[PDB]
């Protein structure tokens, strides 16, 4: 029973290490491809052409 | 002409280096050490924090000094020797006190930012053993966190002064 | 059409495009490994543990890939796939009298059982008869029949009908060490001649003890009187055998009881297996050769 | 749509290529490849290894061995194998160590190339070095019913014998498959495996490396092929990848070339019998005892369960007064035996029918009229002390006898054989039942979760895993049924071990029963808490239910849970239900031999099974049809052969002929029995999986039966007389069983005839 | 030299063809193309089963035959075309016929032979549109399925005679 | 033991928090218990970690969890008063209880 | 929204959140912008996107 007891967080050590895996560390695949978003540089506009 | 470095002290030989290549694209996607973040890519945050080291001709001594590795291109780092998080400690085997000492003390909450200060940190005690509270505390200007507030970090770091 | 050379870790391969270009190369380098269709090869590399630093695939020369209809028989290339052979000679057994289709019938029977269109349709006929397989179902065919094997080197030019000297050792065929299989003839059957093939349904040693013949009668003119008797067999020995002295003390005999009692006497004494020959089956292996023959007996009687 | 025979659910998939078994998986950037480097002695002292050319093969990684496991190196089902061998060496394929390389290629040739340098030990390889070196494990099970001396002594002939059946290879087309993910932290991992235990695949990764259970995820999509192979084995595969990424830190894959499978997995046990039967000259049993031999091989696994079902099985459909069956499991240095679709039953039910067609001969009866003499009846029980309730077996028998036309099939088989002389036929009528129910009470249990998401569609998951008997297809019938909605709208993904935790491996045919039935509390559950808003909205569509219990925060997702009630059988006290329910069938089968070569052609098979009330008549046909053929594999075509040495020599399609397209017979009929719904399982249904494969010995004996009118016609004339047959039948044996004036030496010199 | 062939179609130009690459371990590990299965590597299961064609400079025509996958070296295969089971059709755009017959018969349990026994039969079929019972019978000598028992791959395919 | 619910990890030691809950209401040591992760294949339908309210929410699904499990493991408990708490997880398993709610 | 922008049930939707490396909220719902995206990349060209 810990509860009230200060125990650090779970994963600190880890964190702390760099072994902790986020998102972008899971490792690619062989075949993995990578996106990136075309944005709009217009507050209001008609799209007009994309090229 | 070859480009050699080292990595956690090994011998890192790439024969076709790209002048464009940043270390931190590097270390994260040629060699896989995912310790090392992005957090922004222009200097401003520090989570991509690494240790260089280099012997220098003059000084005769090796200096350690602490980098950006979202701004290092690999070009520049013939001969320089990288140290990252998984260089110094691993729960695997042992922590390095920083890193120990950084997760006992509440310093880790998200812990994306965590790895950057280690490093930090790390870099100030390979150049000062025993620092003052002063050289602690000026030792992050580069290193942001959103999560902690700060205090517990400097807080647990503090027992490294005197 | 030019000659393509491909390097990897270990083997080097040569696709040569001209019957030149082979036999020169195999002139150069006696060691080449000749792949067809791999289907054996490919098991040897994998399973066996072979590394033939040197491979030459002659699969596009023409000549190799001939398929010529002469007035003694049919010849095909050694390059040629079963499956070819299997057609060629489903259209030649169709269209030609019985009387001249024995043989060719033969070979389609140990072509029926055998492997399935993904293996027919890549592997060459040269491929088998060289592989010298003890448990091979062609060899025999061709041995019973005095198929003549077309060999060349650069140079050098024989032909020579397929015997038991063919076959000298396990796996050794006699080529000389610069030679290759050209082509392969399966002869027109005479008149007064009769062929049969027969195989063991199964297997169970890799190359050994499975039984599988041909069987060749040429009788003297519109008589039952024997002028020729060949018996062949693989999965008895470590190499395609033939029944010498059996067949030999039948000539210029009649076609009846007695002989079948003398063939049968004959094949278990000179085909006799010692009760630890390779692949074990001992009684049942005698067995199918003397069954075996007593089927081609009661089926000559009937031709007859 | 329960009872309708929807195809399987993969089936197109399947046909394009798009369904992804464990190697089809996409490989990783950084993902490494595993060999196995296996023994090549049967009994021996490792003295040393040597990787030296290994090394310097390119891409070479490392060597593993027992001194790289963390956690343990005891593995095995009852704790007595090695992950890794460290001294000894107790088999031919015996696991050694494994090579880590960056290609399946660069691992081949690694491992091809490590030297172990032996030392020679004393082999026990055959059943009879293992009885005569007195060499088992446990002691020897039996089951005793009635009185023996009394049996015998009010005998009026007493025949006895033995027997021996040998054993089978999975042949299962995808091969044993594991991939292993480390995930760098906690000693987390997860896993793809071919398996059909994922709850041991799981433990023993975790023990031997020295985790918590609760660190360890291993997920199974579908499986090409089990057939019992997967219930245990797999685990040699995945327990030693997973190590390889312990120890690399990098995922890593193995899939076993056939030979490396074929040597290392092990297969069915075989059997052999010594047997002693007591009956009146009326043909009616009144006696029999039956020692069972099984071959182990080196270790304990499911070996001492299979000898159980074989126990369980000995009478197969026949009643007998009195009656004693002992069983004992032979310690070989051979590939541990392993769980085989029928997991014993074949065996002790060959053992078993092999006595009674002598009985038949020895009356001079005809063996229909025999075996139907016999037969248990209603309400009889088994020599276990279990009633015989909707005993269906008289109902296929008659049934089957009618529809194959029997009587006239077997005039036109006597008739042949007269007119033919190097040629003959023969034609059997055989019966089965099979007992539905792990013998062991603590398997037979089974959970399943579903979610229903808020489009309104639902995610069943449940403790089975699908190897292409439509598993999935069947649970998604009932859910469907069950809810009250469309099969479009219910999907299953694949099994995983964080969803149904500690499921039991799926294996004993019961995986409809069990799983069909937690899916069906599943749903219960689902329908009670939907209940009010159906109310509130009587002619809404199931989506509207759905999101107003969301709106009203009402939980939409549910465990279920079965347990077959009332199991326990003892072998003290004998009695106890072993099992839940039987399965029943019954197979004519007529076979052409020839004579003169030991080959045969299958004319004609029919088949009638209880199934009760099916929840898709094609994938139990499906069912039937699959179980027979591997049956006919197993007592006619399928022979594996070792070396004296212990050394197996069959180790492809080319020395192991499983059955081809051309094998099967040429009139091929199944009939499922028709209203007889079986109150003890999920919507009046019955297992199928396993009860069919021993039909399978319809052609066995069919073969014995136009061998026996081979005999009449070329050696002797008893009428009366026995000769041993044992399992396969191959054409070898067929042959020499054909004594005629070439077997014996003709020529005319004289023996047999 | 370089090797070319083509793979449904696609033009495949390999500048470093190894004499060891099975066709198999191309299409599965270098293509990515997982359709084809191996089942034994020693050419008697099928699970392997592509169709070839080629130009023969000889019958004038094109032929199209079937072919094991893992025993083909990729060097017998200079402009050569290979099709697979993923060429053929697809549950993404629309099944070959023969795809939906064995799919639609319960002639695909398991499914790990399927692939290969739609590429025997769809080779047939690309030989003679209208071929016998006899001829659709003797198709699969060299496919082994463990699941089925055959009969309802043979009924389901018996549509294809007439 | 392994621990899943609706909530996620963001910094804020919810899975901690979550840890620790579970540990006091089983009567266990938090080494016996692990989150790995959150996913909509184990719990569905999860608002979104947000509001402050997850340790309250999430804290007593997790409750309520391991009471089923305490009800369900009772009888082994009393039968075996001295055991250990896989004693009774195993006799459990052994006996047909579902160790999963 | 995965599921809704390709037109197949939730059902076939897996999702998986190990730890974010912060949220306050940004995560909450905006989050979908990419992931969106990446999802239909996978869609359209059948490879692992990110
Ligand atoms: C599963 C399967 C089933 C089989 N079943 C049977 C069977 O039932 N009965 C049977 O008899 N065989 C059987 N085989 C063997 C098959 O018939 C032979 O493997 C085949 O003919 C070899 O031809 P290839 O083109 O593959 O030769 P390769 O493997 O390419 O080479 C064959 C051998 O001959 C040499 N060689 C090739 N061409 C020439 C040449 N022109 N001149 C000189 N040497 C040459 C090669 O160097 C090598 O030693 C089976 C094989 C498999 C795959
Ligand atoms: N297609 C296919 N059918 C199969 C098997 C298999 O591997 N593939 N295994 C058999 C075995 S050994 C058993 S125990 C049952 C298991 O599945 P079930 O419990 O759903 O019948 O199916 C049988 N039918
Ligand atoms: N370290 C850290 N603390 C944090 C956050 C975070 O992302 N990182 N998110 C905040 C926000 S916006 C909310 S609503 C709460 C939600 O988590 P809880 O419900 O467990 O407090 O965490 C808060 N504290
Ligand atoms: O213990 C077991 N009992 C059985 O009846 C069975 N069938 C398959 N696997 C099994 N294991
Ligand atoms: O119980 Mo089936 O896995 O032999
Ligand atoms: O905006 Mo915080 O409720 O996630
Ligand atoms: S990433 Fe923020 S400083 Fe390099
Ligand atoms: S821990 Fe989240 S940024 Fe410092
Ligand atoms: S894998 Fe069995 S033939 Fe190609
Ligand atoms: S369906 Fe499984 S092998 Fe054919």
């Not at chain 2, 998984?86 to 003390?105: D, M, W």
């Not at chain 4, 030693?240 to 193995?254: D, I, M, N, S």
């Not at chain 4, 001079?364 to 309730?389: C, I, S």
């Not at chain 4, 509207?544 to 009203?552: G, L, N, P, S």
Request: net charge neutral.
């Amino acid at each position: 029973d810990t509860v009230g007891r200060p125990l650090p967080h779970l994963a600190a050590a880890m964190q702390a290490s760099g072994e902790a895996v986020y998102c972008d560390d899971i490792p690619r695949y062989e075949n993995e491809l990578f996106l990136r978003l075309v944005t709009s540089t217009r507050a209001h506009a008609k799209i007009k052409s994309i090229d | 002409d070859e480009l050699v470095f080292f990595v956690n002290g090994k011998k890192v030989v790439e024969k076709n280096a790209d002048p464009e290549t940043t270390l931190l694209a590097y270390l994260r996607r040629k060699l896989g050490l995912r310790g090392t973040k992005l957090g922004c890519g222009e200097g401003g945050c520090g989570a991509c924090t690494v240790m260089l080291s280099k012997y220098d001709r003059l000084q005769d001594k090796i200096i350690h000094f602490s980098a950006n590795a979202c701004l290092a291109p690999i070009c520049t780092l013939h001969h320089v020797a990288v140290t990252t998080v998984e260089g110094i400690g691993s729960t695997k085997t042992r922590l390095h006190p920083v890193q120990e000492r950084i997760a006992k003390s509440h310093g880790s909450q998200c812990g994306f930012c965590t790895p950057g200060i280690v490093m930090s940190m790390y870099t100030l005690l390979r150049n000062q053993p025993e620092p003052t509270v002063e050289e602690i505390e000026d030792a992050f200007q580069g290193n942001l966190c959103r999560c902690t507030g700060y205090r517990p970090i400097l807080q647990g770091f503090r027992t490294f002064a005197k | 059409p030019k000659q393509l050379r491909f390097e990897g870790e270990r083997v080097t391969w040569i696709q040569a495009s001209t019957l030149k270009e082979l036999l020169d190369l195999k002139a150069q380098h006696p060691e080449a490994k000749l792949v067809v269709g791999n289907t054996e090869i490919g098991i040897e590399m994998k399973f066996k543990n072979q590394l033939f630093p040197m491979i030459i695939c002659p699969a596009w020369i023409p000549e190799l890939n001939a398929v010529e209809h002469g007035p003694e028989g049919i010849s095909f290339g050694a390059a040629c796939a079963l499956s070819s052979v299997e057609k060629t000679l489903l259209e030649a057994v169709a269209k030609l009298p019985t009387q001249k289709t024995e043989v060719f019938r033969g070979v389609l029977e140990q072509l029926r059982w055998f492997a399935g269109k993904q293996v027919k349709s890549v592997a060459s006929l040269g491929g088998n008869i060289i592989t010298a397989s003890p448990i091979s179902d062609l060899n025999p065919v061709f041995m019973a029949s005095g198929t003549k094997l077309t060999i060349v080197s650069r140079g050098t030019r024989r032909t020579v009908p397929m015997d038991h000297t063919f076959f000298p050792s396990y796996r050794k065929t006699l080529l000389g060490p610069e030679e290759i299989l050209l082509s392969i003839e399966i002869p027109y059957s005479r008149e007064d001649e009769f062929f049969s093939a027969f195989k063991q349904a199964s297997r169970r040693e890799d190359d050994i003890a499975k039984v599988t013949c041909g069987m060749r009668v040429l009788f003297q003119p519109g008589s039952m009187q024997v002028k020729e008797l060949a018996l062949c067999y693989g999965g008895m020995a470590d190499r395609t055998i033939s029944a010498l002295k059996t067949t030999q003390k039948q000539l210029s005999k009649f076609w009846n009881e007695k002989l079948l009692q003398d063939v049968c006497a004959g094949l278990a004494e000179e085909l006799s297996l010692s009760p630890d020959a390779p692949g074990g089956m001992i009684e049942f292996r005698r067995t199918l050769t003397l069954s075996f023959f007593f089927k081609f007996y009661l089926t000559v009687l009937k031709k007859l | 749509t329960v009872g309708r025979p929807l195809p399987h659910l993969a089936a197109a998939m399947q046909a394009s290529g798009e369904a992804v078994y464990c190697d089809d998986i996409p490989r990783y950037e950084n993902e490494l490849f595993l060999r196995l480097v296996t023994s090549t002695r049967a009994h021996a002292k490792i003295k040393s290894i040597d990787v030296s050319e290994a090394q310097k093969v390119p891409g070479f990684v490392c060597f593993l061995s027992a001194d790289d496991i963390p956690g343990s190196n005891e593995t095995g089902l009852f704790n007595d194998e090695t992950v890794f061998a460290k001294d000894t060496v107790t088999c031919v394929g015996h696991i050694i160590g494994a090579v880590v390389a960056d290609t399946p290629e660069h691992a081949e040739r690694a491992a091809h190339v490590v030297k172990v340098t032996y030392e020679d030990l004393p082999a026990i390889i055959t059943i009879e070095d293992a009885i005569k070196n007195n060499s088992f494990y446990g002691s020897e099970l039996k089951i005793e019913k009635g009185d023996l001396k009394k049996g015998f002594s009010e005998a009026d002939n007493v025949v006895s014998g033995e027997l021996y059946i040998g054993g089978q290879d999975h042949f299962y087309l995808e091969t044993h498959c594991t991939i292993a993910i480390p995930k760098g932290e906690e000693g987390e991992m997860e896993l793809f495996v071919s398996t059909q235990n994922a709850m041991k695949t799981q433990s023993f990764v975790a023990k031997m490396l020295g985790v918590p259970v609760n660190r360890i995820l291993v997920r199974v999509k579908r499986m090409g092929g089990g057939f019992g192979g997967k219930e245990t084995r797999s685990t040699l595969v995945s327990v030693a990848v997973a190590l390889a990424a312990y120890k690399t830190g990098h995922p890593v894959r193995c899939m076993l070339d056939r030979n490396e499978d074929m040597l290392i997995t092990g297969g069915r046990h075989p059997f052999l019998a010594r047997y002693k039967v007591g009956f009146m000259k009326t043909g009616t049993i009144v006696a029999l005892e039956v020692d069972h031999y099984s071959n182990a091989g080196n270790s304990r696994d499911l070996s001492h369960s299979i000898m159980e079902r074989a126990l369980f099985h000995m009478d197969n459909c026949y009643k007998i007064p009195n009656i004693r069956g002992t069983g004992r499991l032979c310690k070989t240095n051979l590939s541990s035996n392993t769980a085989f679709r029928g997991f014993g039953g074949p065996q002790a039910l060959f053992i078993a029918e092999n006595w009674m067609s002598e009985v038949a001969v020895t009356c001079g009866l005809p063996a229909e009229e025999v075996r139907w003499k016999n037969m248990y009846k209603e309400g009889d029980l088994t020599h276990f002390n279990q009633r015989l309730e909707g005993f269906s077996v008289p109902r296929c028998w008659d049934e089957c006898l009618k529809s194959s036309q029997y009587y006239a099939r077997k005039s036109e088989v006597d008739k042949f054989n007269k007119e033919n002389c190097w040629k003959k036929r023969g034609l059997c009528i055989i019966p089965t039942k099979f007992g539905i129910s792990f013998t062991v009470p603590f398997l037979n249990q089974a959970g399943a979760l579903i979610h229903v998401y808020t489009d309104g569609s639902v995610l069943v998951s449940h403790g089975g895993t699908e190897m292409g008997q439509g598993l999935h297809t069947k649970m998604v019938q009932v859910a469907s049924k069950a809810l009250k909605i469309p099969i479009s709208k219910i999907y299953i993904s694949e099994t995983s071990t964080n969803t149904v935790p500690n499921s039991s491996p799926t294996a004993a045919s019961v995986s409809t029963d069990i799983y069909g039935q937690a899916v069906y509390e599943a749903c219960q559950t689902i329908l009670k808490r939907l209940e009010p808003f159906k109310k509130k909205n009587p002619d809404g569509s199931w989506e509207d239910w759905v999101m107003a219990a969301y709106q009203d925060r009402v939980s939409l997702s549910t465990t279920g849970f079965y347990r077959t009630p009332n199991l326990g059988y003892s072998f003290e006290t004998n009695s106890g239900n072993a099992f839940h329910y039987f399965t029943y069938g019954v197979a004519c089968s007529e076979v052409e031999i020839d004579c003169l070569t030991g080959d045969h052609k299958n004319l004609r098979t029919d088949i009638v099974m209880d199934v009760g009330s099916s929840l898709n008549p094609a994938i139990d046909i499906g069912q039937v049809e699959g179980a027979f053929v591997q049956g006919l594999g197993l007592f006619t075509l399928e022979e594996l052969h070792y070396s004296p040495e212990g050394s197996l020599h069959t180790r492809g399609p080319s020395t192991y002929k499983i059955p081809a397209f051309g094998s099967i017979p040429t009139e091929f009929r199944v009939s499922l029995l028709r209203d007889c719904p079986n109150k003890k399982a999920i919507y009046a249904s019955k297992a199928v999986g396993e009860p069919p494969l021993f039909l399978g010995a319809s052609v066995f004996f069919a073969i014995k039966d136009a061998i026996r009118a081979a005999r009449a016609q070329h050696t002797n004339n008893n009428t009366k007389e026995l000769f041993r047959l044992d399992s396969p039948a191959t054409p070898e044996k067929i042959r020499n069983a054909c004594v005629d004036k070439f077997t014996t030496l003709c020529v005319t010199g004289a023996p047999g005839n």
